[PDB]
Design an enzyme around this catalytic site. Structure first.
Site, short mmCIF file in Angstrom:
data_model
loop_
_atom_site.label_atom_id
_atom_site.label_comp_id
_atom_site.label_asym_id
_atom_site.label_seq_id
_atom_site.Cartn_x
_atom_site.Cartn_y
_atom_site.Cartn_z
N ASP A 62 10.09 -0.57 -0.17
CA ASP A 62 10.18 -2.01 0.02
C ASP A 62 10.17 -2.74 -1.32
OD1 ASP A 62 7.54 -1.50 -0.64
OD2 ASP A 62 6.74 -3.04 0.70
N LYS B 120 -6.87 -4.00 -4.90
CA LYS B 120 -6.90 -5.39 -4.43
C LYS B 120 -8.10 -6.10 -5.02
CE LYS B 120 -3.68 -4.76 -0.93
NZ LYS B 120 -3.16 -3.51 -1.54
N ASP C 65 8.29 -7.48 -4.31
CA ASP C 65 7.86 -6.58 -3.24
C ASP C 65 8.38 -7.15 -1.93
OD1 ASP C 65 6.71 -4.72 -1.61
OD2 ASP C 65 4.64 -5.20 -2.12
N1 LIG Z 1 3.85 -1.03 5.52
C1 LIG Z 1 4.73 -0.09 5.11
N2 LIG Z 1 4.49 0.55 3.95
C2 LIG Z 1 5.32 1.51 3.46
C3 LIG Z 1 6.50 1.84 4.21
N3 LIG Z 1 7.15 2.79 3.55
C4 LIG Z 1 6.43 3.04 2.44
N4 LIG Z 1 5.36 2.28 2.40
C5 LIG Z 1 4.42 2.35 1.33
O1 LIG Z 1 3.22 1.73 1.70
C6 LIG Z 1 2.62 1.35 0.50
C7 LIG Z 1 1.73 0.15 0.68
O2 LIG Z 1 2.25 -0.72 1.66
P1 LIG Z 1 2.95 -2.03 1.14
O3 LIG Z 1 2.50 -3.20 1.94
O4 LIG Z 1 4.38 -1.64 1.03
O5 LIG Z 1 2.37 -2.17 -0.32
P2 LIG Z 1 1.16 -3.16 -0.56
O6 LIG Z 1 0.00 -2.66 0.24
O7 LIG Z 1 1.61 -4.58 -0.41
O8 LIG Z 1 0.89 -2.84 -2.09
C8 LIG Z 1 1.34 -1.59 -2.58
O9 LIG Z 1 2.66 -1.74 -3.11
C9 LIG Z 1 2.71 -2.41 -4.36
C10 LIG Z 1 4.15 -2.55 -4.76
O10 LIG Z 1 4.44 -3.93 -4.69
C11 LIG Z 1 1.98 -1.55 -5.36
O11 LIG Z 1 1.04 -2.36 -6.04
C12 LIG Z 1 1.19 -0.45 -4.70
O12 LIG Z 1 2.05 0.46 -4.02
C13 LIG Z 1 0.37 -1.12 -3.64
O13 LIG Z 1 -0.53 -0.16 -3.11
C14 LIG Z 1 3.71 1.20 -0.52
O14 LIG Z 1 3.45 2.13 -1.56
C15 LIG Z 1 4.96 1.58 0.20
O15 LIG Z 1 5.63 2.61 -0.48
C16 LIG Z 1 6.70 1.11 5.46
O16 LIG Z 1 7.69 1.36 6.15
N5 LIG Z 1 5.81 0.19 5.83
MG LIG Z 2 4.99 -3.09 -0.33
#
Ligand SMILES: Nc1nc2c(ncn2[C@@H]2O[C@H](COP(=O)(O)OP(=O)(O)O[C@H]3O[C@H](CO)[C@@H](O)[C@H](O)[C@@H]3O)[C@@H](O)[C@H]2O)c(=O)[nH]1
Ligand SMILES: [Mg+2]
Ligand SMILES: Nc1nc2c(ncn2[C@@H]2O[C@H](COP(=O)(O)OP(=O)(O)O[C@H]3O[C@H](CO)[C@@H](O)[C@H](O)[C@@H]3O)[C@@H](O)[C@H]2O)c(=O)[nH]1
Ligand SMILES: [Mg+2]
Lengths: 360, 360
Positions: free
Chosen positions: A110, A160, A211
């Site tokens: 994403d 976080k 993101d």
């Molecule tokens: N929810 C979701 N997450 C996914 C998917 N496929 C992979 N992921 C993985 O799930 C992780 C965390 O969910 P996200 O919502 O996508 O990320 P986040 O928690 O907002 O924050 C994470 O991503 C940031 C990148 O902007 C990073 O800081 C780090 O990965 C962080 O943990 C990401 O590493 C993403 O690769 C999906 O289909 N759905």
């Molecule tokens: Mg993400």
């Protein structure tokens, strides 16, 4: 020579669209989110991409449909470990090792950015140079704050933080060596198992970055991404497409699939995407809005800064404004005003909604 | 000899639970909603049941798991026609004809009642005696108003009248001869193709009846259904189960699966259902609430008149009351009060909600 695109996740934040397809496969502008990363990987030197799919193993058919360009046939899943999927690479440590010894990429499904993937070795520090480049630079509410001095070291890694400043955050693109997959394979759920305190060099974006995993983040990332695409995709000079149906005017840049049909006098606004087979009415206004696929729009609606899902049937004189995500096969009656209301798939909307909310 | 259980439908009304499994397969008390109808049909003289599944053809594995007792192997689907699926019997009119000539049952998958399935002919006319028995007797807002005199005729058939009185509505169980499937096969979507204003008789429920397709309707239907089941299922005399874990007290009748575990002092209220492998805390209060499966409940929650989905993890001192459906794998923190809030699958709730709403 290999990459690990984490695709297993419920996609809770992008929920109205991810109730039908996994978050990697929901189109961003005109192609699925993972497809941009796969194309960038094809641009750099790599052949086989392994996917750690957990939420829905039914993405295999769509991947096989997109399998023509790249050898992304690999698919592994045993049981739900984590959307972050730290055990993802660890659960498939055997395939990455025996085939090749080259460093392997790790990406989120994403994330949208310039996607450098430079052919430069950058072997003094693998992830320090790439991912969050050191001069990312945004709010600290989401993503991990990374504290990096001018010598490219990582000392603190807080997923976080409450209030820790540090505008720099990781881009979500990682490159690792074979030691990481053999370092901490705890065989269960974990969060990225980042042990940056132990090492500083080689142990493991100047561009836009976003993101794209939330509706407002989706819109803003599309706004930042479309201008950067004007160089490559289809190179009447106001936007990418300016004459597909009748005679319509375009303000700013926009992406319109040649399969779409546009009415007489529609005003495709700045940073808007129109999907395949989509039909746009006579005098619509597509202002920073994404139309996914097969959606039909009546005469005079103003879908602004919102997302219109697959196979929708929008009424004649609607107003889908604010951040209001429409699900699959949602039909909206004429004159209905939606402002920040998310509609679940297979629903009919006939009542006005002037406040943010959910439609069941 | 055969029956047509309409199972193809999005289940928009029971949305929080039907995002994971189709409405026919969401358990009512301890068994899937379709299993009661299949058991009644097994009690009457039929052997093969054909299912017209549209929304999710992945119910095949669960049906095969439940196939051990009865030959319900038939499964047909080409393209989405209608949740009502009038073309359902018409699309598979070939199979029903050549195998047998006996009249075939047609049932909704969201109807619960006494299920007469009488061995009597009902040779005055076939649907009329059954279904809405002439004596059904409820609100006219949903279901067709049927005007039946004492001579068993149907004259008017209006699906959703605005204000037409006529408290009599169809039960949802239909029996048809081979002429109906050959009468009007329009090959597309239609609503039950009821041409009863043409014919008076022979061409085509004194007990509880409830259309279990809505959360409040689900709760009320469970409240009506549980007392009628005391005669046959498991026949300590206050409820069906009164000693499964420690020592708890039961008020009124309730179903507790022998696989469940109940804490010391829990008060299983009137008309409550506890699923398999479910764990109930020390001093819970299950008042007219249904716990589906594998759900865990802390010490002292009062889940009242609401539905707790599969694989939930309820906190210690929560209040899941009013009509508040919880989806699959929803975790609730301690002390959280949910009142009429529907929660989508795979969510964590940590904030109070005193008003009806939806949690993404
Ligand atoms: N929810 C979701 N997450 C996914 C998917 N496929 C992979 N992921 C993985 O799930 C992780 C965390 O969910 P996200 O919502 O996508 O990320 P986040 O928690 O907002 O924050 C994470 O991503 C940031 C990148 O902007 C990073 O800081 C780090 O990965 C962080 O943990 C990401 O590493 C993403 O690769 C999906 O289909 N759905
Ligand atoms: Mg993400
Ligand atoms: N939504 C849904 N409908 C289903 C499903 N499976 C079958 N159906 C069929 O879809 C039809 C209409 O959807 P419902 O919500 O179940 O019925 P309704 O529209 O509330 O009213 C219908 O049912 C009444 C029985 O109480 C009847 O009056 C008549 O069927 C009416 O059209 C019913 O005939 C039911 O068999 C499902 O999974 N979801
Ligand atoms: Mg119904």
């Amino acid at each position: 020579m290999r990459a690990v695109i984490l695709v297993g996740g419920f996609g809770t934040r992008l929920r109205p669209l991810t109730l039908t397809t996994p978050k990697p496969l929901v189109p961003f502008c005109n192609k699925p989110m993972i497809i941009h990363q796969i194309e960038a990987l094809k641009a750099v030197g790599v052949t086989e991409v392994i996917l750690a799919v957990a939420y829905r193993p039914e993405a295999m058919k769509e991947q096989m449909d997109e399998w023509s360009r790249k050898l992304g046939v690999s698919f592994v899943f045993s049981v739900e470990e984590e959307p972050l999927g730290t055990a993802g690479p660890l659960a498939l440590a055997r395939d990455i090792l025996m085939q090749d010894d080259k460093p392997f990429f790790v990406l989120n499904s994403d994330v949208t950015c310039t996607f450098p993937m430079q052919e430069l070795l950058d072997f003094h520090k693998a992830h320090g140079g790439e991912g969050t480049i050191m001069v990312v630079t945004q709010w600290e509410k989401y993503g991990v704050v990374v504290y990096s001095p001018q010598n490219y070291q990582i000392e603190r890694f807080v997923e976080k933080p409450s209030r820790f400043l540090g505008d720099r955050i990781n881009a979500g693109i990682y490159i690792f060596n074979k030691s990481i997959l053999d370092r901490i394979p705890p065989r269960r759920a974990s969060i990225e198992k980042e042990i940056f305190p132990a090492m500083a060099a080689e142990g493991q974006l100047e561009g836009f970055w976003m993101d794209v995993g939330q509706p407002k983040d989706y819109i803003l990332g599309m706004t930042k991404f479309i201008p950067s695409l004007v160089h490559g995709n289809r190179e009447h000079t106001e936007a990418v497409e300016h004459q597909r149906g009748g005679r319509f005017t375009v303000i700013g840049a926009s992406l319109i699939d040649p399969s779409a049909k546009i009415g007489d006098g529609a005003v495709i606004g700045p940073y808007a995407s129109i999907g395949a087979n989509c039909v746009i009415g006579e005098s619509c206004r597509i202002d920073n809005a994404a139309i996914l696929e097969n959606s039909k729009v009546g005469k005079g609606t103003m879908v602004s800064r919102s997302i219109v899902g697959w196979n929708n049937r929008i009424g004649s004189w609607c107003h889908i404004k604010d951040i209001s995500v429409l699900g699959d096969d949602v039909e909206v009656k004429d004159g209905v005003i939606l402002i920040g209301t998310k509609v679940l798939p297979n629903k009919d909307v006939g009542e006005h909604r002037f406040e943010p909310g959910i439609i069941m």
